[PDB]
Design a protein around this ligand. Structure first.
Ligand code: FWM
Ligand code: FWM
Ligand code: FWM
Ligand code: FWM
Ligand code: IMP
Ligand code: IMP
Ligand code: IMP
Ligand code: IMP
Lengths: 331, 331, 331, 331
């Protein structure tokens, strides 16, 4: 074995991230403006824009979830707050129209209580929200929810980085599988635990387990440019979840920060010290202020539409069949 | 599949760019000074120097096209201006001798009108000028032009990044195929759309579709050093189109810019905000002032001649048969 | 042969270091807090925490060895000092409880005398401490020690970077094999001698020779983050030896250094000029002051526990069966 | 073909440079101090230290050639000066003992005259000194010299980067083949001409053509550290030629230069503008002042000896049979 030892499976794969690949152009009759950007968030819920905001306390509360839904995506309300408060934000979103809204729960003891409270508040999607879904407690959580409230509510499970983990969530009854163990911009899991999986390879693997069962994959974390959205979907994902790309917007929680005459907002991991207030697996940082959400979403979607133009993808379903070229460091 | 999923074609290729390879020396009786640098721009038109200036409003207007033609290459007049103006520049070039000149057209409604006007002005080459030629509207444009004015005018089509796209343009009747989707120094297509193809691999693929039909390939974008010109031609291209390398010259449009006591000129993408005055796919930048075109061209050609010396290529046709060594990051 | 010459064995392997790989998540019922971090330092000695401090004069004297043992690891007393002094430090450690302690010896003439003196002082582990164990003098040293004092004392041999070297130490009677030729943070062997072996590949190879004989492998050098500890153990190592990660602690030898208002301590190679007071193979540097050892060890172990959680490893023995994904430069 | 086109030979090889590889340790009974560093410079001439100084006007004139010979290596007198002057330097070296000395000639018209003049002055080695030896004029030069003065003088030919070029020089009668097209620290051939070959791969290939005929290979250019010397010899080279590593010494031509309170000397390519006083293929730069040659040579040789210790090479001939591990960017 060229890299050492006698076991060829020790190093199971070569993991590619977004910067490792480019989308290849293909024959096209598709104009960017006419492309259809709608896509399955879950088995039942289709979004007009395949974008979801992260369940983070510096990204999504009621104001973001409302702006996302109006932009044609959805927001996932974070769970770093009292159950009553989170449910009140759900109500607030519903009060503002017939707007889609999701909300994160854990798998702890009050997790079940929290989910029932969100159900009562009218939530559309429950996201069982962990760093590692391949675990009997998370799988049991997903399943219990699905059997109890599954007719009225769609249940998302995550996160996973492998085929077998995605397969287990499908089996457990997930309406969507969320992919991303370690790729987040504010993530330190890779240096703290030494654990991770580059996101393009992780998506390809999850989609191999999920697509045969008609279960959409949400690509979560590591997206830096609108181009990475196209890449993630082309790898087979149905939507993308964004943290950093949306944390700089007016609608995100938090105040402006002035540093050297430039405008920023705080953006922090939910495994950061501050968020947990111990071995943190996220940092607390800043992102540039980017203005209104509507305008950020317009830009990102514009980039996607261009990609659909280049690749001849009339729909997201077609983009999922596009091909990549692997590039080198020099590229 | 080592990089994920079960489909070996998902990641179709490993894309190499200019920095990925070096030309290997070979047995040589060729002195740089005696090497023959002439090459086909199109099926009928041979240039003394295998270089063409980009169709950009910070690179080529009449003064550049005249200087290029006199240097033994050619200029392609940009189309970001009224038809009457562009045609007047064509006339201006023709007024200055029996000088070759090309001009860009689009595929829009006024595209056809523009081309007829250029024809009337005496243009030698029409370049159908898009970011993605593999499209029925571009292919139909190339063909219509070829059937209508093809006996007096050579028609170039572009840009493509794949074998099938190049094949389609040949079929459509192109007299030359221009290669380059995303490699430009001022390009942001790769981060905005996630789309692209490293240029050495793109040239190899285009040449595989074009050379059997006797159609020359123009390598367009990403050339940073005179060495990249030799590399591009060795990959099988017949000419190279230059933007950044020529934008700093006296003959390019625009005034000098003084920054920190150094001289620059603006150089901007035709998909930049400023050029389009929306989702831009180019930036607006600066390049160092490099002085007279004649001297820049002398240097670039000098580098090519040295390459032809090292590789024993008496002619460009021979250089196209040279071999590469792939290098690593460390090199 | 694609990289040159006709001999496929000239370039024997592709060497991976810690940054080349990530641990893949796997099915897990393991909570970080409940994971069992105990591991074999040698055939007979099991540690509560799989960590050993380096035998360096800026890392381990009596105060460090005591703090390490109390934290559940062990310290290896450096040998850059008179025999009487080193033995007095051994006694000092033993005076402070029933604390495990190891001590380095060379293979010179006074080496044997030194080892007997340490034995008399009550040492638990003798580490035969060289940069290259695959040598008749080192092998004979290990063996002589083992046959003479082997019933009361465990004998460690090192360092090696290949399978055959590890095999020779096992044969010689080593109770543990220490791996690391050139990976140290303060090492210059790779630029001075051009010699080395990336540590993940080196561990895989050593473990292939050592594990079938029940001999534990100590991963020595190159560990920068708590994640590298998990990686090293997953590659098959049983413990890790730390220099740089511990040199900044209160318990290490040396005073604080203030530089630009920040706190540091000196950390230097035992092959550095200063340490030898000639062709040095280490540098003299600084590391940031990190406070009490107990707290540094808590953090590192916390990172390991998280890894064991992600990978479903209940014990270190299970973690040694985990799988990696190879990543690219972009990751 | 994964990198493009249909021709698998288009990209002939994967080229490795010194930083791509490390020497693997092996079983050893060799102490650095007792290792035998002697090696063939040519078929007849053996050196005590396998090092030769470059034929450059900022590296070797009489004072350097004398210091090199005394250190047990040799210097090659540059040819950027009148024949009478170069021959007078040869005499000067001979006047200072029974000291080996070499001298560069070209292949021009006065080349032959120059060589006869050096012969008369008592030169021991003529180095036919080009950037590309695979050329009938260079091959004829080597051969003519060999047939005319070959019994008293050893003739070196260079430079080559391929197996076929090395084979042609052997056939032509070369007593040694010098390898290095483009790797020099002051070289711009790779960006100007796009031509080159990474040096480890180039050595492996040259040695494949030269060693079966008993012809020594001189590794010329790209050596940055004493470790690269060991690497070059392990790849099969018999000596190494150094420019940058020696240009900072007291014995090199040129005065001290003070810049920001630090000491430097000028070091410039013989294809630089200044050296030629046009398309330059070298730059004019600075290197740090390093003091006496004797001390620099001691250090470099010290590094080699350490390598011979690690690899168990008693002699240079044994070191040439050592093995490499390929490393990644991360290493
Ligand atoms: O409880 C733990 C530690 C255990 C988790 C699973 C078993 C192993 C240890 N954590 C809590 C949550 N996360 S996180 O906030 O950083 C996180 C949030 C969502 C998506 C993640 C994707 N990859 C990394 C971290 C992520 C950190 C770790
Ligand atoms: O109309 C569009 C968007 C669509 C284009 C094709 C289908 C997908 C979207 N554009 C207009 C022109 N270009 S460009 O000016 O930047 C451009 C000019 C020439 C060569 C290019 C080579 N690669 C990239 C850009 C290039 C940007 C995009
Ligand atoms: O005596 C020598 C030189 C010879 C050693 C073996 C044969 C070849 C030359 N040295 C003495 C000790 N070391 S070291 O202190 O730097 C060292 C200490 C422990 C672990 C090492 C791991 N890799 C590198 C250096 C290491 C340097 C070299
Ligand atoms: O005459 C020429 C140009 C031709 C040379 C061969 C055919 C192709 C063009 N040159 C003259 C000498 N060299 S050089 O001084 O830079 C040079 C000196 C020795 C070793 C070299 C190794 N690789 C690169 C350059 C080297 C530059 C080029
Ligand atoms: O603290 C953390 N450590 C690691 N991952 C996190 C943390 N907090 C949130 N995440 C995940 O990172 C995603 C956003 O990543 P980003 O868009 O690259 O900034 C989120 O949706 C989470 O899945
Ligand atoms: O705005 C843009 N975005 C992407 N590519 C562009 C743009 N404008 C021009 N190009 C292409 O980039 C080529 C020049 O690239 P350059 O020589 O690397 O600077 C041009 O000839 C175009 O094909
Ligand atoms: O001077 C030196 N040169 C090379 N390796 C050294 C030297 N001194 C100590 N080492 C080794 O480097 C290890 C620590 O490496 P680190 O934890 O990366 O700082 C030590 O345990 C030694 O094996
Ligand atoms: O101007 C130049 N351009 C390219 N190579 C040169 C030039 N001048 C000398 N060389 C070669 O570079 C070698 C030294 O390289 P260095 O030791 O890396 O600095 C010399 O011995 C020459 O073979």
């Amino acid at each position: 074995v060229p890299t050492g030892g006698d076991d060829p499976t020790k190093i199971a794969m070569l993991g590619l991230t977004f910067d490792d690949v480019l989308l290849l152009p293909a024959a096209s009759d598709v104009l960017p403006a006419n492309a259809d950007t709608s896509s399955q968030l879950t088995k039942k819920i289709r979004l007009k824009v395949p974008l979801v905001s992260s369940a983070m306390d510096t990204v999504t509360e009621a104001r973001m979830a409302i702006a996302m839904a109006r932009a044609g995506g959805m927001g996932v309300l974070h769970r770093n707050l009292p159950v009553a408060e989170q449910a009140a934000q759900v109500e607030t979103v519903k009060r503002s129209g017939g707007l889609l809204v999701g909300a994160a729960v854990g798998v702890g003891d009050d997790a079940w209580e929290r989910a029932m409270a969100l159900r009562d508040a009218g939530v559309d999607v429950l996201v069982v929200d962990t760093a590692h879904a391949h675990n009997r407690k998370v799988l049991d959580m997903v399943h219990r929810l699905k059997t109890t409230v599954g007719d009225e509510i769609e249940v998302v499970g995550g996160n996973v980085a492998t085929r077998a983990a995605a397969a287990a969530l499908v089996e457990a009854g997930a309406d969507a599988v969320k992919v991303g163990v370690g790729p987040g911009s504010i993530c330190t899991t890779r240096v703290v635990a030494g654990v991770g999986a580059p996101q393009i390879t992780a998506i390809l693997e999850a989609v191999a387990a999920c697509a045969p069962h008609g279960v959409p994959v949400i690509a979560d974390g590591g997206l830096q440019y609108s181009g990475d959205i196209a890449k993630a979907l082309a790898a087979g994902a149905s939507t993308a979840m964004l943290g950093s790309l949306l944390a700089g917007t007016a609608e995100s929680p938090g105040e402006l920060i002035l540093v050297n005459g430039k405008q920023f907002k705080s953006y922090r991991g939910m495994g950061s010290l501050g968020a947990m207030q111990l071995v943190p697996e996220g940092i607390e940082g800043r992102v540039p202020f980017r203005g209104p959400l509507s305008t950020v979403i317009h830009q990102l979607v514009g980039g996607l539409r261009a990609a659909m133009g280049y690749t001849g993808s009339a729909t997201i379903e077609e983009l999922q069949q596009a091909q990549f070229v692997q590039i080198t460091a020099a590229g």
